[PDB]
Design goal:
The protein is α+β, with helices and mostly antiparallel strands. It has a domain at about 10-30 and about 35-80: Roll (SH3 type barrels), CATH 2.30.30.140. The protein is built from two helices and five strands. A five-stranded antiparallel sheet has the order 4-3-2-1-5, covered by helices on one side. A hairpin with a 5-residue loop joins strand 3 and strand 4. The longest helix is centred in the last third of the chain and has 10 residues, at about 75-85. It starts with 9 loop residues before the first strand and ends in a 7-residue tail after the last helix. Belongs to the HDGF family. It comes from Homo sapiens. This is Hepatoma-derived growth factor-related protein 2. It is found in: Nucleus; Cytoplasm. The PDB classes it as gene regulation.
Length: about 90
């Protein structure tokens, strides 16, 4: 059975105006800015951007890849598909 989201989990993350996007739950470094309550720090593959999202916008990658893991014209998306498949736990800093 599923647990709550934890750092390192792989997802597609949804935001307004964007397609479901390959991403991971990040850690928060010692000393760095924490998310709002009930929100997780999401690192978006390809764009390497971070936003704060709740579980309603997080789709576990294994279940969802057949639907959402196809090429997209949007900037950074296809690089992001490569990253989540090939090195999803690397430093992209």
């Amino acid at each position: 059975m599923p647990h709550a989201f934890k750092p390192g989990d792989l997802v597609f993350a949804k935001m307004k105006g964007y397609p479901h996007w390959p991403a991971r739950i990040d850690d928060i470094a010692d000393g760095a800015v924490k998310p709002p309550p009930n929100k997780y720090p999401i690192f978006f593959f390809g764009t390497h951007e971070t936003a704060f999202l709740g579980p309603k916008d997080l789709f576990p990658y294994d279940k969802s890849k057949d639907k959402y893991g196809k090429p997209n014209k949007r900037k950074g998306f296809n690089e992001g598909l490569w990253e989540i498949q090939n090195n999803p736990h690397a430093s992209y800093s």
